[PDB]
């Protein structure tokens, strides 16, 4: 019954944007993106590869309700360096990560056979 | 041995399901020598 | 249209003509799906 | 290698081990997230029934067949069948199947994964194929008809992933572990008399050095080196399961870029 | 109530095993646990998968229509 | 899962876990009247606020069709009514009909719908 339709974990809806930027009133120089329809597979993968970014202060996301796909996340960067910037920095740095494991595994795969 | 007696057809070869189904009473049948 | 138990016979009559079955000689009478095809989701 | 570095334990058709050095566990266990739910796969999803005779009900033997694995090499070139422009489904979003069921021999007649065949156009592409992994080469058991029994369906397969339902599911069981000597304390271990003689080493054990008694815990230590093994139900070879899960989970931080840019 | 299509909680597909493990023991005459393990279920959600459940689909098809 | 309540895998539900079936039962016959007028399944022209389409000519819905809210699953004439609706609550898919008569031989009907139940949150085990 008052079950939401299953696909409503990834697929969007009528204008929502995937990421929508707020400015954190409460300290200066951060911001809290809304990621919609994604969890903890990016949640706290974008967290902790954020943590490594010298010039970033905080870093730390919460998905509001188990229900509704969806998490807040909130940086802040030392003064002047956009933060959405250390985002860009921290994402380019995980697939970048990413493309490495994936070719590393490609060649240490191809070799074994049994 | 339990039958029916229905509108027409008389002696029904009454059975558990057959009655379970058709909505009728598993009634044997009484008979005695006056 | 209907069906039997029993049997497992397709009498298939029409309407007000004795509820009976054709051979057989027992009121089972089932009523046999509609050719219209019927969707399932697959979860 | 180049950073994130991989080294493969074992491996085949179905289980997948290898161990990867240098990697940030937030990432590695949000890969196994990916592996599990969010990578492509085909299966049924509607399922029109002829004529169903079967002790098993209509949507009973539905529930199933989506659950059954269909091929999925490559599935990459099939759209999703909501993001297609067809009325409903057609070819290229959809893998059209059909099975047909007559038991004429008064012994059990089964009804099986190979029973079913595809009544729509591949495009050469490798998918719709019931996998059988069967020893007997018949798949998986669907039903079971008697002397006269009959089932006539036909299966509507489409794109999808386990979070839509987890008959979508690529991979099975994904083995997790990662520091088998806690040496890094991430587990405050549970006794009544001995702690490490009441829980046996992990196989994975042989792997890192013990930890040497006479020492003094290192809080600079990290989450290093993950023991991992990934099994494939049969849609995505265990490398694809692997490396699509590697993947897909990298179009999911760059098309975070995508509307970073539009922004 | 037939084979489980795809364990529960693992998603191993075990439908296929049933005539199998069956036969594991009726012809190989087998321990069950011997024989879940020969048929590659390591995990015991598996193990249960096929252990625990009854085939009552048998016992269906006696009736007639 | 607090207070005595418990979290439960949805991925091994979709696998089938404790998914049920379940079944529903009407009934109706057509009642004799004294002067061997009697009632009479049958698609009428008073009628139930529901959608009478569902129903074949013979007042009955055929197997294998889909049923919600006050859909009728057998149409009866005492023009005057008495067609069973389905109830208000449930929303199934009709599983098998039946048809015979009374140990007084009126048309007897019992019409059998179909649904299978998924763990949902607040179900109880
Ligand atoms: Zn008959
Ligand atoms: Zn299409
Ligand atoms: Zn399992």
Redesign the interface.
Do not use: Y
């Given at each position: 019954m008052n079950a939401p339709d299953?696909?409503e974990?990834?697929?969007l809806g009528e204008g929502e944007?995937?990421?929508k930027?707020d400015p954190d009133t409460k300290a200066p120089n951060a911001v809290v993106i809304t990621?919609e329809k994604?969890?903890?597979?990016?949640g706290?993968?974008?967290?902790?590869?954020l943590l490594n970014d010298r010039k970033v202060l905080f870093a730390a996301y919460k998905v509001e309700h188990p229900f509704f796909a969806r998490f807040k996340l909130r940086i802040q960067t030392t003064e002047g360096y956009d933060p959405?910037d250390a985002?860009?920095n921290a994402?380019?740095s995980?697939?970048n990560?990413?493309?490495?494991?994936?070719?590393?595994?490609?060649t240490?795969?191809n070799?074994?056979?049994? | 041995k339990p039958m029916v007696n229905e509108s027409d057809g008389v002696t029904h070869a009454l059975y558990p399901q057959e009655a379970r189904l058709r909505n009728l009473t598993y009634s044997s049948g009484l008979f005695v020598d006056v | 249209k209907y069906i039997c138990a029993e049997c497992?016979s397709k009498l298939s009559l029409s309407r007000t003509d004795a509820v009976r079955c054709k051979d057989c000689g027992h009121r089972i009478l089932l009523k046999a799906?509609t050719?219209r095809?019927?969707?399932?989701?697959?979860? | 290698?180049?950073?994130?570095?991989?080294?493969?334990r074992?491996?085949?058709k179905?289980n997948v081990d290898?161990i990867?050095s240098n990697?940030?566990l937030?990432?590695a266990?949000?890969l196994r997230?990916?592996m599990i739910?969010?990578i492509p796969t085909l299966?049924?999803?509607?399922?029109?029934?002829?004529?169903?005779?079967t002790?098993?009900?209509?949507?009973?033997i539905?529930?199933?067949?989506?659950?059954?694995?269909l091929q999925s090499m490559d599935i990459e070139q099939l759209e999703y069948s909501?993001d297609c422009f067809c009325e409903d489904h057609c070819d290229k979003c959809s893998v059209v199947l059909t099975l047909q069921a007559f038991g004429e021999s008064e012994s059990?007649t089964?009804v099986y994964?190979k029973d079913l065949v595809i009544v729509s156009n591949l495009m050469g592409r490798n998918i719709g194929h019931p996998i059988?992994?069967?020893?007997?080469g018949?798949?998986?058991?669907?039903?079971?008809?008697?002397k006269?029994?009959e089932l006539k369906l036909?299966?509507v397969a489409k794109k999808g992933?386990?979070?839509?339902?987890?008959?979508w599911?690529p991979?099975?069981?994904i083995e997790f572990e990662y520091d088998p000597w806690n040496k890094l304390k991430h587990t405050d271990y549970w006794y009544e008399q001995d702690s490490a003689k009441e829980w046996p080493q992990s196989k994975n054990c042989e792997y890192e050095d013990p930890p040497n008694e006479g020492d003094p815990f290192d809080y600079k230590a990290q989450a290093d080196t993950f023991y991992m093994n990934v099994?494939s139900?049969?849609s995505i070879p265990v490398?694809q399961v692997?490396?699509r899960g590697?993947?897909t989970?990298?179009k999911?931080?760059?098309?975070?870029?995508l509307?970073?840019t539009?922004? | 109530?037939?084979?489980?299509?795809?364990?529960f909680s693992?998603?191993?597909?075990v439908?296929?095993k049933?005539?199998?493990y069956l036969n594991l023991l009726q012809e190989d005459e087998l321990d069950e646990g011997t024989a879940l393990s020969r048929l590659?279920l390591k995990?015991y959600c598996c193990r249960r998968m096929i252990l625990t459940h009854v085939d009552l689909?048998?016992k269906?098809?006696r009736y007639n229509? | 899962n607090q207070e005595d309540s418990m979290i439960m895998n949805?991925?091994?539900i979709?696998?089938?876990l404790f998914?049920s079936?379940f079944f529903r039962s009407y009934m109706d016959q057509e009642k004799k009247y004294g002067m061997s007028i009697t009632e009479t399944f049958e698609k009428p022209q008073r009628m139930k606020h529901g959608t009478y389409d569902k129903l074949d000519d013979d007042g009955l819905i055929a197997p294998?069709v889909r049923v919600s809210g006050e859909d009728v699953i057998i149409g009866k004439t005492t023009k005057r009514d008495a067609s069973t609706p389905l109830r208000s609550t449930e929303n199934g898919?009709v599983?098998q009909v039946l048809v015979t008569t009374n140990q007084d031989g009126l048309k007897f009907v019992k019409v059998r719908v179909?649904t299978?139940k998924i763990p949902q949150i607040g179900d109880k085990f």
């Open positions: 299953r696909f974990l990834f697929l944007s995937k990421l930027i990621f994604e969890d903890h597979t990016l706290n993968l974008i967290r902790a590869e959405k985002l860009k994402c380019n995980i697939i990560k990413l493309g490495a494991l994936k070719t590393n595994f490609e240490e795969w070799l074994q056979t049994l | - | 497992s799906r050719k095809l019927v969707q399932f989701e697959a979860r | 290698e180049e950073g994130p570095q991989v080294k493969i074992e491996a085949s179905d290898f990867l990697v940030d937030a990432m266990n949000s997230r990916v739910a969010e299966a049924i999803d509607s399922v029109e029934v002829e004529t169903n005779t002790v098993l009900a209509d949507e009973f539905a529930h199933r067949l989506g659950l059954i694995p909501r059990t089964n994964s059988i992994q069967d020893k007997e018949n798949g998986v058991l669907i039903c079971k008809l008697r006269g029994q036909t299966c992933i386990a979070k839509e339902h987890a008959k599911g991979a099975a069981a099994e139900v049969g490398d692997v490396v590697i993947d989970l990298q999911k931080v760059a098309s975070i870029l509307a970073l539009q922004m | 109530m037939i084979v489980p299509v795809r364990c693992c998603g191993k597909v439908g296929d049933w005539e199998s590659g995990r689909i048998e269906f098809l229509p | 949805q991925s091994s979709d696998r089938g998914r079936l294998g898919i599983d179909r299978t």
